[PDB]
């Protein structure tokens, strides 16, 4: 029920002493969403640290990027401290300073109850491909759907008024469900619980409808989900069957199909056109390699979209033993990074190769010592 965070500390750009840069701490794969992330400078907390809006992956685990602007010098040493319910003590990771395709629109919703601390926390984010473009936070000041990409700011007040009305309704719904789910599972009004909703549509390179999604999760575990055919549901336990029958009797799936197949597609197309300078670009990865037993590390920087495959081979066959693959991470400027590692005998590193499959490369690339 609880997943511990994966921590990465890195800079946006390669570090150059005296050159302005950005220090990143990417925490991913954790549950619940409660996390304390600090950026340290010489055993001291960095004052003005910003972070990205809460979002989560297919497995429902959350991810966050904490970042600040800094100018590294010779003496300064940096790190990231992370506290979480799955940790006996805060974990510190030091900044190792010596180190043609489909499209999609996705909406992610998260609600977390706060017994005896006001209404539940509601965070909503919108994505086109790997670019976030809208957000809503119940704790923010605006109480409005807010832009997070240049190309969405062209929309007029009718758009923003409607999105705010709709997102607030998503919020009210999740508030009711939080109490409902508390009753169905016989839990006390003192514990904190998380409800996660996610839906969206996929289109091919021809912008025609491909797939649609609508999924629901309670405390990180699957609750109910729309099948791939968008005409039936998938319940997870005895509690979710009650909602399934209440939704099949209300023919809810028919309404969702129309949105995913029509409205969702229609506005995804409009977004892709309005932000073509951004969304329809492909940044090829700037690739590189780092190095009786030795370590070989294949890297990939400043690429978009995030979809990428780094695989290892020993004399032709995919070696998946003694290999380390790290989660793709955001650079903070819209691009992404990733690397992979493998143990090798110092002297046999020529019988090893790294394969880079990316949507922005003419053909797969090959790298060896």
């Amino acid at each position, epitope marked *: 029920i609880q997943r511990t965070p994966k921590i990465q500390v890195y800079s946006r750009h390669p570090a150059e002493n005296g050159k302005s840069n950005f220090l990143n701490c990417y925490v991913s794969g954790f549950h619940p969403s409660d996390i304390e992330v600090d950026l340290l400078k010489n055993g001291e907390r960095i004052e003005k640290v910003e972070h990205s809006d809460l979002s989560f992956s297919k497995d429902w685990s959350f991810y966050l990027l904490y970042y600040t602007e800094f100018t590294p010098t010779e003496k300064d040493e940096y790190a990231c401290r992370v506290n979480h319910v799955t*940790l006996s003590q805060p974990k510190i990771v030091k900044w190792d300073r010596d180190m043609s395709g489909s499209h999609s629109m996705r909406y992610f919703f998260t609600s977390v109850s706060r017994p005896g601390r006001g209404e539940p926390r509601f965070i909503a984010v919108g994505y086109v491909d790997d670019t976030q473009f809208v957000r809503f936070d119940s704790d923010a000041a605006s109480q409005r759907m807010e832009p997070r990409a240049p190309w969405i700011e062209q929309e007029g007040p009718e758009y923003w008024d409607g999105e705010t009305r709709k997102v607030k309704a998503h919020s009210q719904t999740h508030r009711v469900d939080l109490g409902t789910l508390r009753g169905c599972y016989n839990q006390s009004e003192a514990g904190s619980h998380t409800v996660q909703r996610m839906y969206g549509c996929d289109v091919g390179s021809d912008w025609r409808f491909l797939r649609g999604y609508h999924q629901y999760a309670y405390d990180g575990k699957d609750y109910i989900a729309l099948k791939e055919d968008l005409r039936s549901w998938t319940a997870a336990d005895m509690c979710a069957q009650t909602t399934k029958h209440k939704w099949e009797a209300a023919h809810v799936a028919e309404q969702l199909r129309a949105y995913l197949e029509g409205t969702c597609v229609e506005w995804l197309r409009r977004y892709l056109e309005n932000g073509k300078e951004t969304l329809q670009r492909t940044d090829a990865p700037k690739t590189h390699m780092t190095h009786h037993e030795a370590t070989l590390r294949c890297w990939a920087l400043s690429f978009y979209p995030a979809e990428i495959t780094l695989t290892w081979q020993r004399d032709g066959e995919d070696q998946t033993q003694d290999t380390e693959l790290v989660e793709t991470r955001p650079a903070g400027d819209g691009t992404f990074q990733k690397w992979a590692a493998v143990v090798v005998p110092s002297g046999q590193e020529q019988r090893y190769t790294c394969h880079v499959q990316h949507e922005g490369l003419p053909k797969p690339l090959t790298l060896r010592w």
Partner: nanobody
Amino acid sequence: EVKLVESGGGLVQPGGSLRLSCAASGSIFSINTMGWYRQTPGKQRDLVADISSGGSTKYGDSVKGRFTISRDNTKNTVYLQMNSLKPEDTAVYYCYGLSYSNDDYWGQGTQVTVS
């Protein structure tokens, strides 16, 4: 490499107060930030308060206003004045310190109990 000597725990009545103190050994230039985390009923320990050598403080939300952390100019020693204590503040309070290279040191901890 560094030792953290703690003192000032014990039992107190609700509404009462306590002063913790934590003194670091080793080089005076080998510790920057000092403070206290406290044990939760579960697995984790939460931030209570800490302070940098320069006096920059941060408090956990649940102790804001009631708890005050201070530092002695000379000796690497910090002081936690815990006022208006409630039963929910019962916990083992762990002192900690950060090296100027972001290395963490932790003390044994001191039980605090509020009837």
